[PDB]
Design a protein around this nucleic acid. Structure first.
Ligand SMILES: [Mg+2]
Ligand SMILES: [Mg+2]
Ligand SMILES: [Mg+2]
Ligand SMILES: [Mg+2]
Ligand SMILES: [Mg+2]
Ligand SMILES: [Mg+2]
Ligand SMILES: [Mg+2]
Ligand SMILES: [Mg+2]
Ligand SMILES: [Mg+2]
Ligand SMILES: [Mg+2]
Ligand SMILES: [Mg+2]
Ligand SMILES: [Mg+2]
Lengths: 177, 136, 54, 104
RNA sequence: UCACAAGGCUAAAACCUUAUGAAACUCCGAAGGGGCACGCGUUUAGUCCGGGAGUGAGGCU
RNA sequence: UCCCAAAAUGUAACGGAGGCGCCCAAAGGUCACCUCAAGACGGUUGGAAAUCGUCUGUAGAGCGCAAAGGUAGAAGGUGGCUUGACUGCGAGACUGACACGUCGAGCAGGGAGGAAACUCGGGCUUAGUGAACCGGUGGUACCGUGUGGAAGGGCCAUCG
RNA sequence: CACCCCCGUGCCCAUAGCACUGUGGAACCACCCCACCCCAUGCCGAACUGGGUCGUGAAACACAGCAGCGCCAAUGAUACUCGGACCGCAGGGUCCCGGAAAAGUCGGUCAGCGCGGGGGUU
């Protein structure tokens, strides 16, 4: 919510650091994107009941069931079946869930000195998915079964990777050293 | 020699040779004169022939290649019931088309290794040297 | 058609009218399992709705 | 993408229907509803809005849709076929419609 | 699209230079061929309706 | 269906490959909306391939099955309502020795989706079929023998 | 269309395309702002869409530069070929006379033609 005005603490934090021509010409962050991709093996009604409750309580948003891209390799695969779950979070609820992260997700991480600062989207965007589920403000072991993990990808209108780097970091992000 | 997988079967026709009538890969090059067919063994022949002559070992460019399935019916049947199983394989070498390029040996080695090569084939032949310069 | 075929059985559509009429087509029987409700014309009037008769 | 516009553009079977194409541009807050014989590469009506609209924004619809249909009835052009482009037909351009659907 | 001659290069597949084969390959593509029109310039046939058929084993360059 | 088939249709072979005798109640009518295969980077199970993300991206995909032609302004992918997989017809043509077979504007009765102009008498198309005869069945009241009735028969439908 | 220029739309279906690039903001476009209901997401105002600005010229769009790529492409010459003739047992080949590509080379090109509208030329 307030992270809005924080974005606006960044707007000339780099418009005065860089030397841009304009204020819209500085990297915004369209959507955060969450992928709960069990799949390959896990074909139970219960783990998608669970992935549903989980996603819909943590980000307060209905989850879309992404299916088998007709990819039926040698192993256990076929055509019309859930091999990945998705919840796109953008703007408002994006800023809210990302704040849920930096506030009540990032410290909660068991063993954590920051995350991977190597050049992500060579176009200058980002991803970062992360294992563990037992590091949360919403995901409780007292409200789940066994352990899962998330996979997240944030999009940043940066031109290059140093500019996304800077963006993400001045926004409230730890880059391990 | 033979190929890997394909269609299976064929037919035949003639009229002059497309490309490549030019001396690439080598300094010296032997060139067909007759609208032949040529077989796996007919060329492996010249492989082993010239490869005798050059010793260790030259540099030998077989510019031709068998891709044609030729058949023969089972011996002794009256025609009908089929087309012949695939007897052997054929490179459909037309004239002016160049079959062999070598270098990494001298002029004498080209003359002779090509002589011995061409004494193994259904064709009169001429050996020569480069200058065909449309594209190296 | 081909007698001992159990799916796509050929059955007719008798009018709810009672005109004295029937259409004729083919349900997969791995589908309906109860009957069929269709809305075809009927020369002896105009627009009946038909029950998939035995 | 473009798709939708060119889709409707061809489902207006260019001239072969006989009638008259009716454009729109409700994607800005300056629109452009037009009238075309499409076969003849000419335009025959023209209800703009950039030379002072009224004051309204999407209420302006029925109004330039009444101005157009007026310039139409004046020209003589008494029959419709409704082009669009990327537009749903529901609200704004739907108003333009209703008040052109009885407005000329 | 299947094939395949050398070489590059990487972890080979791709892809670059060099390179070629195809009835079931086709960026390309004639000569001819066919329909319609005209007859601008020659020549004789055509088409319909009704009677009688025979032929329906073909052969060679 | 594809070469063979000599750039028009056609054409044989105990010549060269392959497929059909169904399927679809939605996979049809309409209305609206969405765009594909892959490769690179980067990412929890994974990690050749799964899911997500971005840059590339005119077809290198998809069409229930065979391939060829076709297709991205959709025929491909998703929903809303739906029974045009409709009777009475048939201008005009493709095709065949015949019998068949194929396409079809438009008219009527009467509908379906659109707000509309519209579109539809089955599916992208070309395989998914059997002439007569004898008989079953649902209508129909044309024939029924001195007469009026009924058997039986005809006509439309249809089943083997 | 009076001159430029922008908005919608067509004939033309790449000598009209892409990338590299510079111009471009109240004058149109776009982003942007918010959305409880219209209306919509197989989840989300991302998109369809309802409220309206400033703001930004960035992105997208429009214009201009640009021959690196794509596209287009000669003449000459050849292949093949109608029809005249012929040679070789044959695989095949020649002669006369016309038609005559493909690919390559010369090069050529940031299209060209409309209608209506809005908006400016102290
Ligand atoms: Mg070219
Ligand atoms: Mg006979
Ligand atoms: Mg004969
Ligand atoms: Mg012919
Ligand atoms: Mg014959
Ligand atoms: Mg009999
Ligand atoms: Mg009866
Ligand atoms: Mg009776
Ligand atoms: Mg001749
Ligand atoms: Mg000549
Ligand atoms: Mg010429
Ligand atoms: Mg330009």
């Amino acid at each position: 919510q307030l992270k809005t005005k924080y974005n606006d603490q960044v707007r000339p934090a780099l418009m005065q650091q860089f030397g841009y021509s304009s204020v819209m010409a500085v990297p915004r962050i369209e959507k955060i994107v969450v992928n709960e991709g069990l799949g390959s093996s896990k074909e139970d009604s219960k783990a998608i009941d669970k992935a549903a409750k989980e996603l819909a309580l943590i980000t307060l948003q209905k989850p879309i069931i992404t299916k088998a891209k007709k990819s039926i390799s040698n192993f256990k695969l076929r055509q019309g079946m859930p091999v990945g779950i998705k919840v796109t979070l953008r703007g408002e609820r994006m800023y809210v869930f990302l704040e849920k992260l930096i506030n009540i997700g990032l410290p909660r991480i068991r063993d954590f000195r920051g995350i991977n600062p190597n050049a992500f989207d060579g176009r200058g965007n980002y991803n970062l998915g992360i294992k563990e589920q037992l590091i949360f403000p919403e995901i409780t072991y007292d409200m789940v079964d066994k352990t899962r993990g998330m996979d997240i990808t944030i999009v940043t209108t940066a031109k290059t990777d140093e500019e996304a780097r800077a963006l993400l970091q001045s926004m409230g992000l730890p880059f391990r050293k | 020699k033979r190929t890997k997988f394909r269609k299976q079967f064929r037919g035949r026709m003639t009229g002059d040779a497309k490309g490549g009538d030019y001396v690439a890969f080598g300094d010296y090059g032997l060139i067909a004169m007759e609208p032949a067919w040529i077989k796996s063994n007919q060329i492996e022949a010249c492989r082993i022939v010239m490869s005798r002559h050059f010793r260790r070992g030259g540099k030998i460019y077989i510019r031709i290649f068998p891709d044609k399935p030729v058949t023969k019916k089972p011996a002794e049947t009256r025609m009908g019931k089929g087309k012949g199983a695939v007897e052997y394989w054929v490179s459909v070498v037309k004239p002016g088309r160049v079959m062999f390029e070598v270098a990494g040996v001298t002029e004498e080695q080209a003359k002779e290794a090509f002589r011995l090569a061409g004494h193994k084939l259904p064709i009169q032949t001429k050996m020569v040297k480069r200058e065909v310069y449309d594209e190296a | 058609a081909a007698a001992g075929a159990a799916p796509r059985i050929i059955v007719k559509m008798e009018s709810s009218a009672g005109t004295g009429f029937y259409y004729t087509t083919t349900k997969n029987r791995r589908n309906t399992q109860a009957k069929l409700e269709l809305k075809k014309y009927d020369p002896v009037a105009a627009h009946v709705v038909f029950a998939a008769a035995a | 993408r473009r798709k939708l516009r060119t889709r409707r553009k061809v489902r207006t079977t260019t001239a072969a229907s006989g009638k008259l194409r009716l454009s729109v541009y409700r994607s800005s807050k300056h629109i452009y509803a037009q009238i075309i014989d499409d076969s003849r590469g000419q335009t025959l009506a023209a209800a703009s809005s950039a030379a002072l609209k009224s004051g309204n924004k999407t209420d302006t619809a029925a109004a330039v849709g009444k101005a157009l249909a007026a310039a139409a009835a004046e020209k003589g052009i008494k029959q419709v076929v409704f082009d669009r482009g990327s537009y749903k037909y529901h609200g704004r351009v739907k108003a333009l419609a209703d008040a052109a659907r009885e407005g000329g």
